[PDB]
Amino acid sequence: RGSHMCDAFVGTWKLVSSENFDDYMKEVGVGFATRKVAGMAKPNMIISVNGDVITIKSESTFKNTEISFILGQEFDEVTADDRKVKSTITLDGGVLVHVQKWDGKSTTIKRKREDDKLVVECVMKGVTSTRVYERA
């Protein structure tokens, strides 16, 4: 089994900057106490690929979470803020596009490589948050 373009995401990443994330969590519907505690967190993101299966882990003082998935195939996810969502992740021109649907709501998380960084864009309606990660 050979290399894949998405191996560019593989590695250990740490959060280095965040913008508008509190507003993004508000639009998602995250309650007060969770927003305050989660807004303080500096998560590590650990991405690995094994065959068709991509695994993304998030570790922080707030919560430790993990998702494993195959591109284009819907799965059940319990988010860090305790939402139970249906998720589908696909590869669009080098960008991992992650859509979560729940309670009639929808949010989109994009992960992309920019220079030596992994840039995350969290979009909920008209509210966007940027989370920038660097190699740990």
Ligand X SMILES: O=C(O)c1cc(F)ccc1Nc1cccc(Cl)c1-c1ccccc1
Segment interacting with ligand X (CB under 6 A) among 2-10, 68-76, 78-86, 87-95: 78-86
81 is an interface residue for ligand X by CB under 6 A = yes
Give the nearest distance from C-beta 51 to ligand X in angstroms: 22
Q: How far apart are CA 76 and CA 67, in angstroms?
A: 9
Q: Which residue has the tokens 């696909």?
A: 90
Nearer to ligand X, 4 or 85 (CB): 85
Q: How far apart are CA 8 and CA 96, in angstroms?
A: 11
127 is an interface residue for ligand X by CB under 6 A = no
Give the nearest distance from C-beta 4 to ligand X in angstroms: 19
100 is an interface residue for ligand X by CB under 6 A = no
Three-class SS of 21-45: HHHHHHHHCCCHHHHHHHHHCCCEE
Nearer to ligand X, 7 or 42 (CB): 42
- State whether residue 113 is helix, strand or coil: strand
118 is an interface residue for ligand X by CB under 6 A = no
127-135 and 44-50 strand pairing: unpaired
Identify whether the C-beta of residue 38 lies closer than 8 Å to the C-beta of residue 81. yes
Give the nearest distance from C-beta 78 to ligand X in angstroms: 11
Segment interacting with ligand X (CB under 6 A) among 2-10, 38-46, 66-74, 84-92: 38-46
- State whether residue 6 is helix, strand or coil: helix
Q: Which positions touch ligand X (CB under 6 A)?
A: 15, 25, 38, 41, 43, 58, 60, 62-63, 79-81, 109, 111, 120, 131
